[PDB]
Design a protein around this ligand. Structure first.
Ligand SMILES: [Cl-]
Ligand SMILES: [Cl-]
Ligand SMILES: [Cl-]
Ligand SMILES: [Mg+2]
Ligand SMILES: [Mg+2]
Ligand SMILES: [Mg+2]
Ligand SMILES: [Mg+2]
Ligand SMILES: [Mg+2]
Ligand SMILES: [Mg+2]
Ligand SMILES: [Mg+2]
Ligand SMILES: [Mg+2]
Ligand SMILES: [Mg+2]
Ligand SMILES: [Mg+2]
Ligand SMILES: [Mg+2]
Ligand SMILES: [Mg+2]
Ligand SMILES: [Mg+2]
Ligand SMILES: [Mg+2]
Ligand SMILES: [Mg+2]
Ligand code: NA
Ligand code: NA
Ligand code: NA
Ligand code: NA
Ligand code: NA
Ligand code: NA
Ligand code: NA
Ligand code: NA
Ligand code: NA
Ligand code: NA
Ligand code: NA
Ligand code: NA
Ligand code: NA
Ligand code: NA
Ligand code: NA
Ligand code: NA
Ligand code: NA
Ligand code: NA
Ligand code: NA
Ligand code: NA
Ligand code: NA
Lengths: 145, 119, 115, 246
RNA sequence: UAUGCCAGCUGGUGGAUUGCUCGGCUCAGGCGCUGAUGAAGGACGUGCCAAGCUGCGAUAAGCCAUGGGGAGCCGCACGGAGGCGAAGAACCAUGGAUUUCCGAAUGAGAAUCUCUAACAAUUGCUUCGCGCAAUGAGGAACCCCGAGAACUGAAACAUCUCAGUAUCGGGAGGAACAGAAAACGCAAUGUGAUGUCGUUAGUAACCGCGAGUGAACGCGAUACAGCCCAAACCGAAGCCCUCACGGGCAAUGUGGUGUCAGGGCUACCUCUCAUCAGCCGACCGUCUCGACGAAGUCUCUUGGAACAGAGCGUGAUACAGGGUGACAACCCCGUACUCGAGACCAGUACGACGUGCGGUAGUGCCAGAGUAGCGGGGGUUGGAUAUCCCUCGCGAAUAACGCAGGCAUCGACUGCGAAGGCUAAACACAACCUGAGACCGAUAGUGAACAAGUAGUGUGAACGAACGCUGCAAAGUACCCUCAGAAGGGAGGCGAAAUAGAGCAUGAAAUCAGUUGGCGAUCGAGCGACAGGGCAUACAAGGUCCCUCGACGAAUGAC
RNA sequence: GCAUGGCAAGUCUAACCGGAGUAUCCGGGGAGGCACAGGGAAACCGACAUGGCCGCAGGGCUUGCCCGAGGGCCGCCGUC
């Protein structure tokens, strides 16, 4: 049996004094009324903050951590094996509708990896090279200057 | 229409010619054999036997057929009024069986015999 | 009130073993399974690798998921395994249903609880 | 496991491997959920007239005449919920979503599970079905799909000691309550489900309480009427095979 | 024991309850315009007897033809008298005849009548004559174009919000509107008419930057369709009325060409399968209607009646639903299967006829102005500098030019040609037909299951109910008595039942009459709860209870 | 938020399409949403698959001693 189902006979249905559940006054106003007066509490302060750049001037990066790549190298049999070599663009989902593919340096790299991507973080490079690997920047990646 | 209200309605409000089907009774075996039909529209000439009411067992000539009320009067199937006058006790064709047909109508017999049409 | 008849049965088995045999992990696991599903365990392989050890059955009072790598040749016992988890485990060790571990080890010995 | 095929005379004719799905753990809770969803999804939207009881300029006289402040017109109370001929306070509504969602995986799992419940003679008898057989489901040859007369399908069932279930379903119940006034006067026990592969058995369909389905689209409902697992079914050699990849 | 209290019994009052459903409510599919050839709506008529309703219209519940249908019939409506139908009536479908007065109401006037040939009025054509035509008004909502609140929210309130909502004016169709880029702007080596659905997203944008408000490009789907002028160059080669004759229009340009795969012109190549005009003209499907259509009406028992129980038997491509004197696959209508017709799809698709697609070079010949654009003032929008619109003023170019790409100017780049036009399908609504339902079941559900927008109220705008159920069959109570009596009553008759006897199934409570039990004219008021007594009680559905004595015997505990 | 259930580094389809037993139902449909990294107005940059210590449950051992998920205390890392 639910709470609603036990209300018949209670009279007030849990509202306390029958003088309680009336109109908007019981809520201190309609909607967000008095968000900086009587009900200021737990409301973010009033005002403007910052600015926005036009949607069509914004670039959305396709990102992936080395940990992801490294953890699935064996499972990625459909990709090149060498002295493993992988073109990140073919790994990261949502890579088509993105402005570019960037690799980030989170986690470890327990394999000699040769990664090709449009972008790489300083940490991604270091970690890959520290495991006897190489970072190949795409022709699109030739924007670094 | 599978809905009971629509069923009963179409029966009570069916036009006159569509009411002929409401006055149909089962044909005897000999007649079924002879005409290739299980039942027929009871006519005022036919002879029938009562299979269900208080008059079940009795037989007689169909004196009348009412299409509006979908009911028939069979000879000797009566009720004695208070004054003593015997009057017809209406019957539903469903509680009745045709044991002889009045074939004076050319058209009736025609349809009764043709395998492609029913009577 | 659990709704899954299989879970109910499992929980009853766990109890029966905990009481009959000298096992105390089964009755412990049973108490977690009776608790709300949200509190149950959701462990990915990366953790089983970090804390398990050979000849010590890893007992998960919940479900195992396939994120991360497992190299240790360990026997993992859980309520359920994601299709990937079960596949990745049988590759280097063995994935077992809690119902089996109750029959193979009613004493609940040499077992490590992981969540 | 193994399933024994039967010819149109009721005699064995070899056998095939009972597909794996029939080994799926019976999960009545999930089956019940799939049937509930199925039944709810075919329910029609209803609701009283938006304006019923509101078509009046009735007003309250207020204080002064020893009467309660109730809107009235021509000295007759109206509109308000407590008034005869007044609006229904919280009536049924057309806008209400009377459907139920169910994950494909969850629903498929229930189909497989109900399918599996078919291969359990004990479940089947428990569900209420009446038969004198031992093995189940009742597997038959593809030539069943060629039968035409219902009477033929009867003899075959009588041969398979499974016809008793139809004597069970050969009794309509005249329900209690007003459903009667809406065309739901009758009800009858569910009997044998006939699954074929090309087209539903036109021959068996009219059998008292029987249902006819096809392997490609047979569902939780026909497999488990009313969410109850274990329906006395009869598959077609090909149906059995086709039902495996479901 | 008066007046009287509590409870019951018999009868009543009342109309709840239960059962029933000819009505509703809601969803879904189909379908969809009518009217000066006088609609819709209204009035008044019309029947043997006719008040209401329905129908119909002085040919008046109807006349004719064809088709179907069939032995019956004369609407609801079951009387009395009479009549019709085998010369094929009734009844159904299609088509036609008739079709009063008012009514857009149109000769003129007028509360449905009247006065002396009439498109009144406004228009187009015009033989300049009302000669040929158009418009007007209705319709459930939907649709398009204009006018445009306030309560309210902001806990006050003015911008904001309610809301471009309510309401008002004008108008189209079966659908409207929109629509083949002076587009988009995931900026591209990209997309490619328009609606609509899903999403993008409560995102961008707006806002006493408060409350609140709020897109689009794109994407996935639905359905897909693309064309014609103006001008250049031609220049009467042309169009409309009329059978013809003949008349009218048209140089202030009819007609050819042509329309960004720019075109024209000049010189060439090649060619048509584009496009445009006209002819033909469906299948399938869908919606509705119709034909045909299997098998028990066997035994026994109960009953007023088997559709019940028991026994025996049958059909099923048919065990949906309904009817029938009680629970029916096999008694009757139907239902599965098969078949036929109509309507919509659609004058569409396919087909064919005619036309001719396209390409090169040259050519500053052509290409829509109060426009693009700027400024003042307003409205509107998310549109912010960057929405759409109105108003006042100002105001350009000519493709070698112009516009756009979310502030202005110049340059580049990319897209694209405004100020002319048309356009199938996919979407809305629900009048209309049909289907459906975990909806309501007569105080419910529509206001309306009934005379329902009825009775009735208001000068009027407008407002607006209540009323469902005899029985299997009327067998609806003959005869006699009483009475002022077709009243009523008594006796009596019918039926299983009249306590089914007419607003008649069942028949609660409040409550009334008579009556039984208890109390009662010396006595006190939340009417009772728990204890214990009196009196009262057919059975049934409860069967315990009393005293001697004895066994057991907690706390407590004596004379 | 919570209880139950499915799947799980993923998960779910929407309109819509086909089938069919034709509003149910079977199969397609991942457009898009949320999750998978955060920080910063923005430009722009971009993290612990575990380094230490306590220690509950549980396990281990020759019965106080080890191992101790989760949890708690730190370290360290991205960014402003
Ligand atoms: Cl920004
Ligand atoms: Cl984990
Ligand atoms: Cl695009
Ligand atoms: Mg995507
Ligand atoms: Mg015949
Ligand atoms: Mg009401
Ligand atoms: Mg009831
Ligand atoms: Mg006049
Ligand atoms: Mg206010
Ligand atoms: Mg304020
Ligand atoms: Mg607004
Ligand atoms: Mg846009
Ligand atoms: Mg032309
Ligand atoms: Mg505004
Ligand atoms: Mg009513
Ligand atoms: Mg007045
Ligand atoms: Mg009565
Ligand atoms: Mg006294
Ligand atoms: Na409360
Ligand atoms: Na209250
Ligand atoms: Na408030
Ligand atoms: Na009204
Ligand atoms: Na009063
Ligand atoms: Na709904
Ligand atoms: Na229509
Ligand atoms: Na009359
Ligand atoms: Na007429
Ligand atoms: Na005219
Ligand atoms: Na004239
Ligand atoms: Na306020
Ligand atoms: Na005020
Ligand atoms: Na504002
Ligand atoms: Na895209
Ligand atoms: Na009968
Ligand atoms: Na202006
Ligand atoms: Na542009
Ligand atoms: Na009533
Ligand atoms: Na007493
Ligand atoms: Na997706």
């Amino acid at each position: 049996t639910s709470k609603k189902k036990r209300q018949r006979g209670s009279r007030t249905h849990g509202g306390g004094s029958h003088k309680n559940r009336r109109g908007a006054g019981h809520r201190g106003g309609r909607g967000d009324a008095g968000r900086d007066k009587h009900e200021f509490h737990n409301h973010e302060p009033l005002g403007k903050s910052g600015f926005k750049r036009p949607q069509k001037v914004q670039e959305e990066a396709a990102t992936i951590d080395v940990r992801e790549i490294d953890e699935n190298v064996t499972l990625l049999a459909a990709d090149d094996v060498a002295e493993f070599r992988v073109d990140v663009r073919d790994v990261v989902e949502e890579a088509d509708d993105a402005d570019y593919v960037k690799v980030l340096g989170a986690g470890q790299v327990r394999h000699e990896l040769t990664l090709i991507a449009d972008d790489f973080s300083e940490g991604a490079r270091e970690k890959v090279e520290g495991a006897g690997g190489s970072v190949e920047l795409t022709d699109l990646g030739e924007e670094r200057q | 229409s599978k809905q009971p209200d629509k069923q009963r309605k179409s029966q009570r409000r069916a036009p006159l010619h569509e009411r002929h089907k409401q006055v149909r009774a089962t044909l005897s075996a000999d007649l079924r054999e002879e005409y290739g039909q299980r039942n027929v529209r009871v006519n005022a000439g036919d002879t029938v036997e009562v299979l269900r009411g208080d008059f079940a067992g009795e037989e007689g000539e169909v004196i009348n057929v009412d299409l509006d009320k979908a009911v028939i009067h069979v000879e000797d199937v009566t009720l004695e009024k208070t004054d003593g006058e015997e009057v017809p006790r209406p019957l539903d064709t469903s509680n009745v069986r045709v044991t002889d047909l009045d074939l004076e109508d050319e058209k009736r017999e025609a349809r009764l015999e043709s395998e492609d049409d029913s009577a | 009130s659990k709704t899954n008849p299989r879970l109910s049965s499992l929980i009853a088995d766990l109890k029966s073993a905990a009481r009959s045999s000298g096992g105390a992990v089964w009755g412990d696991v049973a108490e977690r399974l009776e608790k709300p599903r949200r509190t149950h365990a959701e462990v990915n392989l990366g953790r089983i690798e970090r804390y398990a050890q050979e000849d010590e059955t890893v007992v998960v009072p919940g479900k195992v998921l396939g994120s991360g790598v497992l190299q240790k040749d360990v026997t993992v016992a859980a309520v359920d395994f994601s299709g990937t988890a079960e596949t990745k485990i049988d590759q280097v060790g063995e994935a077992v249903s809690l119902e089996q571990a109750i029959e193979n080890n009613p004493e609940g010995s040499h077992v490590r609880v992981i969540r | 496991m193994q399933a024994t095929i039967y010819d149109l005379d009721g005699n064995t004719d070899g056998e095939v491997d009972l597909p794996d799905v029939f080994e799926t753990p019976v999960r009545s809770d999930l089956i019940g959920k799939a049937v509930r969803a199925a039944q709810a999804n075919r329910k029609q939207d209803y609701g009283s007239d938006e304006y019923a009881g509101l078509r009046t300029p009735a007003e309250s006289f207020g204080s002064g005449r020893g009467q309660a402040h109730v809107p009235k017109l021509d000295g007759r109370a109206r509109r308000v919920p407590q008034a005869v001929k007044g609006r229904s306070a919280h009536p049924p509504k057309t806008e209400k979503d009377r459907s139920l969602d169910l994950n494909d995986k969850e629903r498929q799992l229930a189909v497989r599970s109900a399918l599996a419940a078919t291969a359990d003679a004990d479940l089947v008898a428990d569900r209420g079905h009446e038969f004198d057989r031992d093995e189940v489901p009742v597997v038959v040859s593809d030539d069943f799909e060629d039968l035409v007369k219902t009477q033929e399908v009867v003899s075959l069932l009588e041969a398979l000691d499974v016809h008793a279930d139809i004597d069970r379903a050969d009794e309509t119940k005249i329900k209690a309550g007003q459903g009667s006034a809406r065309g739901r006067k009758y009800r009858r026990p569910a009997s044998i489900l006939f699954v074929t592969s090309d087209e539903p058995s036109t021959a068996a369909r009219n059998l008292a309480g029987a249902d006819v389905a096809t392997a490609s689209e047979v569902n939780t409902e026909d497999l488990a009427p009313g969410g109850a697992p274990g329906r006395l079914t009869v598959f077609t050699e090909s149906a059995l095979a086709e039902v495996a990849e479901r």
